[PDB]
Amino acid sequence: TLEKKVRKGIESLITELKLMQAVLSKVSKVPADQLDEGVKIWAGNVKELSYQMEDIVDAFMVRVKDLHRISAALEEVVLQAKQLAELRQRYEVDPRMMALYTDVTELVGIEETRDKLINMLTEGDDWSKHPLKTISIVGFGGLGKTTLAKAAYDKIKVQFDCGAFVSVSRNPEMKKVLKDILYGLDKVKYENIHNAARDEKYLIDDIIEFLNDKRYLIVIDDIWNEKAWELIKCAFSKKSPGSRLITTTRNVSVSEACCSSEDDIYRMEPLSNDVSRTLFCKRIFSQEEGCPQELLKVSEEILKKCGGVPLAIITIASLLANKGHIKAKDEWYALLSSIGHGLTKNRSLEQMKKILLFSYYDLPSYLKPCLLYLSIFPEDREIRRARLIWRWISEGFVYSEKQDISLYELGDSYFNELVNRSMIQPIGIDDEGKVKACRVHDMVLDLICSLSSEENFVTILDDPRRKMPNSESKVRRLSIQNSKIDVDTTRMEHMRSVTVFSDNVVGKVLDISRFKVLRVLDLEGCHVSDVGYVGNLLHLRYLGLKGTHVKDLPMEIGKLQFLLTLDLRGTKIEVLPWSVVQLRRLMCLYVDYGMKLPSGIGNLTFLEVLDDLGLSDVDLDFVKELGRLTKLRVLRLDFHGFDQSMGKALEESISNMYKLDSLDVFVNRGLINCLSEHWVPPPRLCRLAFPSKRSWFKTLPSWINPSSLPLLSYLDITLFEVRSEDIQLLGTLPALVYLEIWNYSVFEEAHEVEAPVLSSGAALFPCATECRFIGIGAVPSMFPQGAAPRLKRLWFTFPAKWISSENIGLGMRHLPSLQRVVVDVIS
């Protein structure tokens, strides 16, 4: 009766939201320069309305007395929708092109990189019969990728018969690009080629016929969306030895679409600190950098933030010298402090923010929110990608309608797409075999931070800014920072997410239970233990509590039916409440082994990754429950006290799952009496690690064969003895990028390290970048250099008794960078 109308209004509401997101995605494509300002006001309002409507829908869906308030909110939200509708109806050249015409004798540091590039493509010009090859140059924003190409072009030009410098935009017109290529080749025969409009085809044929029996060196720069370039490639398809191509792009994933070989892809790096200092002083100062002596420290600090981008340095140098160091120690501090909050809103600096925002506008949808989510975290720190992915999934930015996806691999794809688009620097490798953490450039950071503050996406509280937007009623995301002063909490009822960064101001001054709705709650790095009110929260999806001094967890947490993640690492809790099996949806569960897991985990069927499961004092039904839930991807094992046929039971129980890709078992000073040689492994595995070293295997497992688990790229294996046939058996494994084997008997007993011999096969190492051998003598002369084309490091034991022997006749340079190696020699 009463509920029927609200149920039949919810679908109308969701359809309305779909149209609203459609139009919002449409308007956000064009840059805010060709967009009339009235439409911008309207779009902002429609965004706020979308927030309100989606909050209503989520409230209803989680809740189902509340029907009365929900219905009232429904009709009034319909009221604002209509009112805004009639209120709206009532009223109705490339910045980086000029940089190309810059003086040659102003570039600093071009010659070394330019000479390296010329000899890495012109090395075959001597005996100019090598087939044509292409060189891609990859970078982000402005790192002279275009300038360097022109510097190389202007030097080696007299030794080719043709040549053209042609550019491609974000959305090229293919006819224009090909006409430009034609016009540059000969300006006399094809003088008015831009007037003639034949088709995409006949002019490609014109190029092909014109490029008969010549060496050209055509350079094509700023290629986005490789689908564009695969049309140009058909212009260069006839064999033409002695001719080459140069390609530049800000998208690394389109470079392997070129030249088909990693050796030709030219990653290029920022300037060094010395060269950056020289360029910075050359623009501002007259002739000597030692004259001021008092803003030198400010100079190096401000130079550190740019890092090595000739762009940021050039813009800062211009802005900081209006007329000979207009002022010192005050405006330089102003520019140091203005990074992060407001430096972008300035003068003659906009000419470089367009060049940066090209990338951001190039993104598809569903990636703009993910990129903007970076504005939450502080300036200079590493962000763990797992935290990003889980926060994204809980926020709602990751979804699809394909049902063959787990929703986490999708987030990883989004992260990788952001990485390859040259917007995040990935560093480190975590235990999952993927990127550990990530960081963003400062000017990209403050740029997107201002862009987010332009709408109500994110609210940031800093001492340098000390500004709080005029409308406190409508705030969704809040990120508290070192500011522990303005902690107002009055008028945030619909509060989307909240986080605290290394601040004791949490708890004592700020209250959380006031927030009726709250999607995520991130609090890692605090030292507060009063969390018992989470039962009152109902829509909470993320609960991060890593290293938070929380003593105990409230029992009534089982009501939190909608939940996704639960991080409890680094805490002092030791027991989990029993009402955790009542909870239904989870995908990750970060629990240290010191904690005790109550029985009933078989209820949690949706689990996708479980970390550091401590198996101590467990009975068999609980052991076999683990194979019931067939959705885990990553699992971690450590134990000390059930080494029985219980081990065999769970050893065959793990095979019941088929979604695994990484595993590891931890046990100290013990043989692995769990794995039997007769057991099929999961069809998918990637890591299969074994962190403990005081444990061992009697023999190498037989089930590790090239037949099964052929996708391995990680071993971390240890065993008691060693046989010269195990290495040959292991080499036939397809990828095995990473290897690590330990000889327990050698480093525990008086065992003379023998020399295993590679009998069968020829190379056995198509790509094994890292190979580590402990307690095993691996001379570099297991095979000639054509065995492991990719091998950067090698570790082995070398007895001193083989120094006078003839079997260690090494000294040759193998194919990869096999020149920095130290061996622990034993007398």
Ligand X SMILES: Nc1ncnc2c1ncn2[C@@H]1O[C@H](COP(=O)(O)OP(=O)(O)OP(=O)(O)O)[C@@H](O)[C@H]1O
278 has binding-site annotation: no
* Least gap, CB of 467 to a copy of itself (angstroms): 5
* Candidate residues 20, 81, 107, 735; the one interacting with ligand X per rule CB under 6 A: 107
Element (H, E) at 22: helix 2-27
- Which of 464, 214, 218, 212 is closest to 341 using CA atoms? 464
* Least gap, CB of 352 to ligand X (angstroms): 9
In single-letter form, the type of residue at position 338 comes to S
Q: Is 109 in the site for ligand X (CB under 6 A)?
A: yes
* Candidate residues 179, 250, 353, 385; the one interacting with ligand X per rule CB under 6 A: 250
811 has binding-site annotation: no
Report the Cα 322 to chain-centroid distance in Å: 39
Report how far residue 23's alpha carbon sits from residue 766's, in angstroms, rounded to the nearest whole number: 50
* Least gap, CB of 187 to ligand X (angstroms): 24
Report how far residue 492's alpha carbon sits from residue 474's, in angstroms, rounded to the nearest whole number: 7
Name the residue nearer to a copy of itself (CB basis): 467 or 527.
Answer: 467
- Only segment of 99-107, 388-396, 486-494, 630-638 that touches ligand X (CB under 6 A): 99-107
The partner in contact with residue 99, picked from a copy of itself, ligand X, none with C-beta cut-offs of 5 to 8 angstroms by kind, is: ligand X
The partner in contact with residue 467, picked from a copy of itself, ligand X, none with C-beta cut-offs of 5 to 8 angstroms by kind, is: a copy of itself
Rounded to the nearest 10 degrees, the angle between the axes of helix 66-89 and helix 37-63 is 170
The partner in contact with residue 143, picked from ligand X, a copy of itself, none with C-beta cut-offs of 5 to 8 angstroms by kind, is: ligand X
- Which residues ranging from 34 to 63 are in contact with a copy of itself (CB under 8 A)? none
The partner in contact with residue 102, picked from ligand X, a copy of itself, none with C-beta cut-offs of 5 to 8 angstroms by kind, is: ligand X
Report the Cα 679 to chain-centroid distance in Å: 36
- Which of 214, 289, 274 is closest to 244 using CA atoms? 214
* Least gap, CB of 443 to ligand X (angstroms): 13
DSSP labels, 334-397: HHHHHTTTTTTSSSS-HHHHHHHHHHHHHS-TTSHHHHHGGGGS-SS--EEHHHHHHHHHHHT-
Q: Is 96 in the site for ligand X (CB under 6 A)?
A: yes
Contacts of 101 by beta carbon, 8 Å cutoff, 6+ apart: none
Report how far residue 583's alpha carbon sits from residue 154's, in angstroms, rounded to the nearest whole number: 68
* Candidate residues 403, 490, 819, 827; the one interacting with a copy of itself per rule CB under 8 A: 403
The mark string for 464-493 relative to a copy of itself (x by CB under 8 A, - otherwise) is ---x--x-----------------------
108 has binding-site annotation: yes
* Candidate residues 67, 99, 363, 528; the one interacting with ligand X per rule CB under 6 A: 99
The mark string for 439-468 relative to a copy of itself (x by CB under 8 A, - otherwise) is ----------------------------x-
- Which of 258, 262, 222 is closest to 132 using CA atoms? 258
Q: Are 515 and 498 in contact (CB under 8 A)?
A: yes
Report how far residue 626's alpha carbon sits from residue 311's, in angstroms, rounded to the nearest whole number: 55
Q: Are 562 and 538 in contact (CB under 8 A)?
A: yes
In single-letter form, the type of residue at position 465 comes to R
Q: Is 314 in the site for ligand X (CB under 6 A)?
A: yes
Report how far residue 174's alpha carbon sits from residue 168's, in angstroms, rounded to the nearest whole number: 9
- Which residues ranging from 154 to 193 are in contact with ligand X (CB under 6 A)? none
133 has binding-site annotation: no
Q: Is 145 in the site for ligand X (CB under 6 A)?
A: yes
- Find tokens 């429904």 and name the residue: 74
The partner in contact with residue 287, picked from a copy of itself, ligand X, none with C-beta cut-offs of 5 to 8 angstroms by kind, is: none
Residue 167 CB-half CA count within 13 A = 11
Name the residue nearer to a copy of itself (CB basis): 403 or 804.
Answer: 403
The partner in contact with residue 250, picked from ligand X, a copy of itself, none with C-beta cut-offs of 5 to 8 angstroms by kind, is: ligand X
Of all residues in this chain, which one has the CB nearest to ligand X in the complex?
144
Report how far residue 818's alpha carbon sits from residue 373's, in angstroms, rounded to the nearest whole number: 42
Q: Is 252 in the site for ligand X (CB under 6 A)?
A: no
* Least gap, CB of 364 to ligand X (angstroms): 19
Number of chain positions touching ligand X (CB under 6 A): 22
250 has binding-site annotation: yes
Residues 713-745, buried b or exposed e (16+ Cβ, 10 A)? bbbbbbbbbbeeebbbbbbebeebebbbbbbbe
- Which residues ranging from 332 to 371 are in contact with ligand X (CB under 6 A)? 355
The partner in contact with residue 403, picked from ligand X, a copy of itself, none with C-beta cut-offs of 5 to 8 angstroms by kind, is: a copy of itself
Report how far residue 762's alpha carbon sits from residue 525's, in angstroms, rounded to the nearest whole number: 53
Name the residue nearer to a copy of itself (CB basis): 7 or 201.
Answer: 7
- Which residues ranging from 369 to 408 are in contact with ligand X (CB under 6 A)? none
Report how far residue 518's alpha carbon sits from residue 541's, in angstroms, rounded to the nearest whole number: 8
The end-to-end CA distance of the chain, in Å, is: 90
Q: Is 276 in the site for ligand X (CB under 6 A)?
A: no
**Could you tell me the two tokens for 386?**
């797992």
507 has binding-site annotation: no
143 has binding-site annotation: yes
* Candidate residues 59, 141, 496, 544; the one interacting with ligand X per rule CB under 6 A: 141
- Only segment of 96-104, 442-450, 651-659, 740-748 that touches ligand X (CB under 6 A): 96-104
As annotated, the binding site includes 96, 108, 142-147, 250
Q: Interface residues with ligand X (CB under 6 A)? A: 96, 99, 102, 107-110, 139, 141-147, 222, 250, 279, 310-311, 314, 355
As annotated, the binding site for ATP includes 96, 108, 142-147, 250
Q: Interface residues with a copy of itself (CB under 8 A)? A: 401, 403, 467, 470
